[PDB]
Structure 1
Amino acid sequence: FHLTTRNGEPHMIVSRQEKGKSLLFKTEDGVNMCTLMADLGELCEDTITYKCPLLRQNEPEDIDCWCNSTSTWVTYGTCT
């Protein structure tokens, strides 16, 4: 995935071949591990973009993306 930013915050452009794998990227505050559980398809015009909240010792609820060290934005296409 391509690591960029959105208003100072880290942003992940996730491609199709990353479905099912732990997303890791270094940050001043250590290594960040986001988990993507998404309709994740091929990167195209039909993108969706939203935030993966920070979750410390809390079970996830009503979400398919979350990181454990620093909240991150994520973007991926839905095409197939």
Structure 2
Amino acid sequence: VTLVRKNRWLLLNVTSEDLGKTFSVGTGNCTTNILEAKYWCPDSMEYNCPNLSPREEPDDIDCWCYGVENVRVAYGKCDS
């Protein structure tokens, strides 16, 4: 995984190697469970990762963060 600061947003750039992994981001954490994700290519996807409350269980999302604001996940579906 690579995490980059782009303007107001913080970009979670993940691969198939990051499947289900949780990462410590600053004072909070972030998690992605995206089977679709493989390696980067123009056939990509980028969207928001909801900032959840301490006891907020994920609902209808495959990417989320606890205590981290303005994070978007991005991934590719191509093989290296």
Q: Same fold (TM over 0.5)?
A: yes
Does structure 1 residue 8 correspond to structure 2 residue 17? no
| Aligned equivalent of 1:51 | 48
How many residues were matched structurally?
76
Runs of 4+ in 1 over 3 A off after TM superposition: none
CA deviation vs aligned residue, 1:21-78 (integer Å, no higher than 9, x gap): 112222xxx2x21110111111212110001011112222111010001131110111
TM-score (norm 1): 0.80
SS at match of 1:17: helix
Q: Which runs of 5+ in 2 are unaligned?
A: none
Does structure 1 residue 35 correspond to structure 2 residue 35? no
TM-score (norm 2): 0.80
Does the 8 Å contact 1:6/1:73 carry over to 2? no
Does structure 1 residue 61 correspond to structure 2 residue 59? yes
Does the 8 Å contact 1:16/1:43 carry over to 2? no
Does the 8 Å contact 1:54/1:70 carry over to 2? yes
| Aligned equivalent of 1:18 | 18
Does the 8 Å contact 2:21/2:33 carry over to 1? no
Q: Which runs of 5+ in 1 are unaligned?
A: none
